[PDB]
Design a protein around this ligand. Structure first.
Ligand SMILES: [Zn+2]
Ligand SMILES: [Zn+2]
Lengths: 361, 362
């Protein structure tokens, strides 16, 4: 594996450096481009959420609860805990006739500084319904009810809802159960680790499913549901994150061409629908991108992800300029003097078919 | 060829994040005794340079005249939390030199303390210059500029005579030629130096050595007396150097005068340790300096590694170091109070030749 870094400087003097791992894969998970170790065993954290939403959506009779595309986007969310997110979470609890008291996720400081500031003013202590993963938890309760397993312990790994989740994640990764490791997340659910490239493969399968559905092609019920999750995230991107959040601004910029999702401690996944851009990357289908910053730095993650989209020619300069504040983190001191910047000396490595493209592959 | 030395975090035994560690442990002459990573890494010292800047201030002819006390000198050496007491002391220091807040050329920022920020956020308080974590250093630089007769205007600019004194003093404490120290601009809008990481340790060894010389009642150069004075001000006013719940403050209170420690932004740290049974056991007959950089800049990981280093080096009793356990072993507890993982130190100290294969390295 290569020595691929994002580097910060102060007056040209190196401040911090951050090791970058990245996989770019086709609809079958074949590796097209890489940084660092693209097979790094990686906790996907919230970037696993679409796989968890598929498990929920494949549960007999969850159709019955009348979840809309905005609700599915919230199941797929690390939301900012804005009032709209809390209100959708409550409306989802009503649709399954459950109560806040059924939630086994806990409250935390908002992922949005402006939300935190609102909460600090109101001396508000966040509760379970405020969890960035609240949507997932309501989705898991819904699954738990529909299975007839009861909602008690729906979060526990031996609950049948979690056995559906583990099985679904392994299958989307094309891995044996033994190849997927499990810990416990901040929101108190089981959370998977698998090779970084397989997160890319999950998202390439979402984008691939969207293309199959749109092409009015016949589709397995699994593929139909993946198309539905893609559409839900792309068309309700504020539900997936919130105002000023990377994921939201990324998916609004791309206006349905891709979905993207943060994982805590600096993983990211994108599924890109077949396009002129993906064709020039030497695949005729959809594409998956997965990234991990080794040290967990989110600011560096969003810079690297945006740089990779630019390097890969995904969207136009004009679409990607909506993310300029993320691409090029500001280094402006307390007196408004620019003191340095962020550089990307990493160099994409290519599959054999991409080797020696001077477009730095 | 520098070692692959990491602090590693896990979730259920599964690697989450890893952070590359650089560290130097040096004697009073700056000779390297132990290392992690690249002990000579060119490193922006940021706020860890503050004792050297304070020396430039205290060696300025006539600064004595203003009657700065030890708590004031600690504030010069501070990255404070912008507690009311730090803002009050900054105003008292401006009073001693008859300057106004408007003369400061640092800007306000969100407090280094979450509790202070929450207080400010609640009162929609916009922090101003006097609130800067570097406010004490800036008042000291203004004081130096005034006493030079250069005048306070442009005191912060690299070509101002006060910054000339700073740049010379930093290179001198490092035992480096001027061209071996690089300069950028800090968050507080002052020049800020970069030099090999071991020279940060060397500065802190010299602070502690000076303190030893002073307390031994040995004859000392005016510079060594000034270094001793800085050591004493930091060790005896540790709340002024940082604040409530801050690593630097808790570390220096725990050690009760045996060492000083100081953060630099983007996760550098420096400690100067007075000659002790511990330093003797480490194979040196004088004071010791420790300098650390976390390559990716993570402060939580810096405090964990620094504390782990003091433990591996036997500096302090386990009881003294236990005051820092919350920093040493960062908690990994989820929103429902379940422990989900922790932090490991699989890095391994490398020794000078006289320290090779001491099994206490691990
Ligand atoms: Zn979660
Ligand atoms: Zn400063």
């Amino acid at each position: 594996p290569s020595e691929d870094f994002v580097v910060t400087d102060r007056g040209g003097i190196v401040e911090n450096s951050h090791r970058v791992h990245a996989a770019v894969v086709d609809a079958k998970g074949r590796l097209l481009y890489a940084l660092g170790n693209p097979t790094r065993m990686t906790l996907a954290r919230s970037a696993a959420k679409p796989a968890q939403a598929l498990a929920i959506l494949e549960t007999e009779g969850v159709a019955g609860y009348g979840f809309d595309d905005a609700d599915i986007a919230l199941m797929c969310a690390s939301h900012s805990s804005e009032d709209r997110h809390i209100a959708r979470t409550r409306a989802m609890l009503s649709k399954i006739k459950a109560e806040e008291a059924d939630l086994r996720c806990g409250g935390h400081p908002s992922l949005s500084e402006m939300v935190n500031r609102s909460w600090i003013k109101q001396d508000f202590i966040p509760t379970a319904v405020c969890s960035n993963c609240s949507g997932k938890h309501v989705g898991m309760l819904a699954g738990a009810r529909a299975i007839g397993a009861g909602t008690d312990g729906y979060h526990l790994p031996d609950h049948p809802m979690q056995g559906r989740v583990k099985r679904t994640v392994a299958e989307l990764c094309d891995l044996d159960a033994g190849d997927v490791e499990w810990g416990t997340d901040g929101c108190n659910l089981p959370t998977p680790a698998f090779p970084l490239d397989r997160l890319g493969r999950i998202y390439a399968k979402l984008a691939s499913a969207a293309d199959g559905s749109d092409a009015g092609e016949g589709q397995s019920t699994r593929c139909a549901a993946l198309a539905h999750i893609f559409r839900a995230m792309a068309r309700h991107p504020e539900m997936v994150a919130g105002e000023g959040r990377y994921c939201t601004m990324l998916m609004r910029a791309f206006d349905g061409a891709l979905v993207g999702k943060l994982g805590a401690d600096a993983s990211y996944a994108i599924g890109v629908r077949a396009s002129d851009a993906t064709r020039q990357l030497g695949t005729d289908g959809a594409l998956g991108i997965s990234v991990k910053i080794e040290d967990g730095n989110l600011e560096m993650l969003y810079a690297v992800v945006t740089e990779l989209l630019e390097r890969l020619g995904i969207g136009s300069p004009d679409v990607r300029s909506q993310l300029a504040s993320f691409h090029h983190p500001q280094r402006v001191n307390t007196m408004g003097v620019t003191t340095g910047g962020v550089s990307f000396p990493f160099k994409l490595r290519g599959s054999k078919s991409n080797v020696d493209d001077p477009r730095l592959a």
